[PDB]
Amino acid sequence: LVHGGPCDKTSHPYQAALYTSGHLLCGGVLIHPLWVLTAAHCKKPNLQVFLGKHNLRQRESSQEQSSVVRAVIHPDYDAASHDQDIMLLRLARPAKLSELIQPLPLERDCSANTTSCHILGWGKTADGDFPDTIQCAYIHLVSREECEHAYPGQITQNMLCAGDEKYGKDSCQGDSGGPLVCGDHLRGLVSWGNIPCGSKEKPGVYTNVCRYTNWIQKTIQ
């Protein structure tokens, strides 16, 4: 995440870190004791899920690890256009909850008017390096008209744009699958966007979570 800053230690209990080959690959969102929601492009064999993490370089009393017993990628995910970039990860066992490990409710209403949101992750920062401490940044949802104007012919109904015209705060490589939180509900998942990262002109594009309430519900059931 570029142009942001370190998150408060107790503000991201729903944040999951996804690892493979010993390195962080993506972020994810705990939406149920047995399920972590993330981006479909975070699919890799032998994913490791870490909950209750804040600083990657410090062993934290609240961190819990888990293996993935099953990964459900959206049947219509398209890795070229990024359409339907969503995947559900079933944990070996239900997550143990506490102040630092909690699920995040999904935004079911696509017309929700809460525009001031925030993103977070351990992805690449402005200096081009990967932080040990998770980063946070507040951004705003951008109208679909402006979204489509920035990315003509590349935005589908399954995508939502968000960015920061002042500092260009934006998600980046490594933040993929992480949450776009609006009004205490999950509004989107880090999917793709401008490269180099920065959202002043080209806003970040997120998976439109409100569109998948039925699919997720049916999958967890």
Catalytic residues: 41, 85, 176
Nearer to Mg ion, 77 or 122 (CB): 77
Rounded distance between C-alpha atoms, residue 173 and residue 85, angstroms:
15
Judged by DSSP in three states, 40 sits in helix
Nearer to Mg ion, 76 or 146 (CB): 76
Tokens for 202, please give them.
């080209």
Closer residue to Mg ion in complex, CB, 85/164: 85
Binding string, 48-77, against Mg ion, x = CB under 5 A?
Answer: ----------------------------x-
User: Are 173 and 120 spatial neighbours (Cβ–Cβ below 8 Å)?
Assistant: no
**Least distance (Å) between residue 78 CB and Mg ion:** 5
The one-letter code for the residue type at 141 is: L
Q: Residues in contact with Mg ion, total (CB under 5 A)?
A: 2
Q: Does a cis peptide bond (omega within 30 degrees of 0) precede residue 196?
A: yes
Supply 205's token pair.
């594009």
Q: Can you give the C-alpha Rg of the chain in angstroms?
A: 16
The smaller minimum CB distance to Mg ion, of residues 78 and 146, is found at 78
Annotate each residue in 74-113 with x if it binds Mg ion (CB under 5 A) or - if it does not, as one string: --x-x-----------------------------------
Contact 137, 71 (CB under 8 A): no
Taking CB atoms within 8 Å and a gap of at least 24, the contacts of 212-216 are 212/74, 212/86, 213/106, 213/108, 215/74, 215/86, 216/31, 216/37, 216/88, 216/106
Q: How far apart are CA 206 and CA 189, in angstroms?
A: 5
Return the number of the residue (82 or 118) whose C-beta is nearest Mg ion. 82
CB of 213 to Mg ion, least distance (A): 20
Q: Which residues bind Mg ion (CB under 5 A)?
A: 76, 78
